[PDB]
Amino acid sequence: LSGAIVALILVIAGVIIAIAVVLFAFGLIPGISNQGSIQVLGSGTITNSTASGSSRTIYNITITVKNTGTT
Amino acid sequence: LSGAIVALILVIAGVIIAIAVVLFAFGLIPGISNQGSIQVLGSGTITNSTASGSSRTIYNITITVKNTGTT
Ligand SMILES: *[C@@H]1O[C@H](CO)[C@@H](O[C@@H]2O[C@H](CO[C@H]3O[C@H](CO)[C@@H](O)[C@H](O)[C@@H]3O)[C@@H](O[C@H]3O[C@H](CO)[C@@H](O)[C@H](O)[C@@H]3O)[C@H](O[C@@H]3O[C@H](CS(=O)(=O)O)[C@@H](O)[C@H](O)[C@H]3O)[C@H]2NC(C)=O)[C@H](O)[C@H]1NC(C)=O
Ligand SMILES: *[C@@H]1O[C@H](CO)[C@@H](O[C@@H]2O[C@H](CO[C@H]3O[C@H](CO)[C@@H](O)[C@H](O)[C@@H]3O)[C@@H](O[C@H]3O[C@H](CO)[C@@H](O)[C@H](O)[C@@H]3O)[C@H](O[C@@H]3O[C@H](CS(=O)(=O)O)[C@@H](O)[C@H](O)[C@H]3O)[C@H]2NC(C)=O)[C@H](O)[C@H]1NC(C)=O
Ligand SMILES: *[C@@H]1O[C@H](CO)[C@@H](O[C@@H]2O[C@H](CO[C@H]3O[C@H](CO)[C@@H](O)[C@H](O)[C@@H]3O)[C@@H](O[C@H]3O[C@H](CO)[C@@H](O)[C@H](O)[C@@H]3O)[C@H](O[C@@H]3O[C@H](CS(=O)(=O)O)[C@@H](O)[C@H](O)[C@H]3O)[C@H]2NC(C)=O)[C@H](O)[C@H]1NC(C)=O
Ligand SMILES: *[C@@H]1O[C@H](CO)[C@@H](O[C@@H]2O[C@H](CO[C@H]3O[C@H](CO)[C@@H](O)[C@H](O)[C@@H]3O)[C@@H](O)[C@H](O[C@@H]3O[C@H](CS(=O)(=O)O)[C@@H](O)[C@H](O)[C@H]3O)[C@H]2NC(C)=O)[C@H](O)[C@H]1NC(C)=O
């Protein structure tokens, strides 16, 4: 008797998990769009920024950046 | 005589108890078999709900949900 009862449970669970994975694949798609939100325009400039006698070398960097995302 | 009457009682009792268990197995099917589920549609969002330098951070999970079951 036992075998058929187990088969019925695993059939119904199989449908539920399979549908969930298909919906997840469609649910990813919006998140792919954000990967291209930025671009860098023209040359930038580096400048030596560290104070006299200081241990750390530090540089100032300046660039033009355009954001086209929603955040 | 005794042996055959006892043999007959245990045949009839065997039929009764076996059929009772078969009827029990058919009685499980409505509980274990149950189509439909909650389905999650598209992307959801997280938003910061935390305020006023509070001790616990709280977030907001908005998502679209479809209950295909009967409950
Ligand atoms: C960014 O700016 C820093 C200063 O704001 C620079 O630090 C100064 O570096 C001088 C030499 O730079 C050369 O050597 C570096 C390694 O030591 C190298 O990383 C650099 O790319 C570059 O090739 C240094 O001069 C000292 O060393 C010279 C020989 O390398 C020597 O000729 C000098 O007399 C001096 O001993 C500076 O040290 C300071 O020099 C003062 C005098 S003067 O050099 O200003 O005329 C002196 O009074 C002081 O005691 C001494 O420490 C050093 N610091 C300063 C304040 O100038 C850093 O290199 C820059 N980095 C880049 C990439 O440009
Ligand atoms: C590297 O980047 C640093 C920031 O990341 C720069 O620090 C900023 O310096 C500004 C002045 O720099 C000028 O003078 C230097 C000699 O002192 C020279 O080496 C530089 O090349 C440059 O010619 C400073 O601006 C001050 O002066 C402005 C007028 O010119 C005035 O409008 C400002 O209000 C300010 O008084 C920056 O200011 C600081 O500004 C803060 C606001 S914001 O400017 O960041 O928007 C303000 O909150 C703060 O109180 C004030 O002190 C100063 N910025 C910072 C963050 O320190 C540094 O100059 C860069 N180095 C080079 C070589 O370009
Ligand atoms: C969601 O909102 C939350 C509440 O505004 C944010 O949690 C708070 O973050 C503050 C610092 O923010 C930055 O650094 C984070 C890493 O530490 C980073 O995740 C963030 O994206 C952001 O870049 C934090 O301020 C504390 O830390 C600062 C240094 O990072 C410091 O300057 C502050 O003085 C302070 O210590 C908040 O912490 C709480 O600050 C209270 C004072 S005030 O900041 O409100 O003025 C202080 O009284 C309290 O004891 C201390 O815990 C912190 N809040 C909490 C509850 O943890 C969170 O970053 C936001 N984003 C995400 C993705 O969760
Ligand atoms: C997370 O989700 C909760 C609801 O579960 C939501 O609470 C609701 O908040 C709005 C106002 O929110 C705005 O201000 C807060 C700061 O206070 C910001 O963090 C938010 O980003 C918003 O800018 C309230 O207007 C809601 O009202 C209560 O509204 C009820 C009706 S409801 O349909 O809005 O639920 C009324 O019945 C009540 O009388 C009234 O007090 C409030 N709703 C609830 C149920 O709490 C948070 O704002 C959400 N957080 C974020 C960050 O969005």
At residue B70, φ and ψ (nearest 5 deg) are -100, 5
Q: Which resolution in angstroms does this entry have? A: 2.6
AA letter at B48: N
In whole angstroms, what is the distance from residue A24 CA to residue B40 CA?
A: 8
Burial class (CB in 10 A: 0-12, 13-18, 19+), A42: exposed
Are B60 and B49 a contacting pair, CB within 8 Å? yes
Cβ atoms of residues A39 and A63 within 8 Å: no
Q: Which atom of ligand 3 is nearest to the CA of B52?
A: 45
In chain A, the residue whose alpha carbon lies closest to the alpha carbon of B21 is A1
Give the pair of three-digit tokens for residue B41: 């549609």
Given an 8 Å threshold on Cβ–Cβ distance, is A30 in contact with B43?
A: yes
User: For residue B29, which residues of chain A lie inside 8 Å, CB to CB?
Assistant: 5, 8
Residues in chain B: 71
Ligand 4 test: best mutation among B45, B49, B54, B57, most atoms within 8 Å of CB?
A: B49
Q: Which helix (H) or strand (E) holds A7?
A: helix A2-32
Biggest alpha carbon–alpha carbon distance for chain A? 88
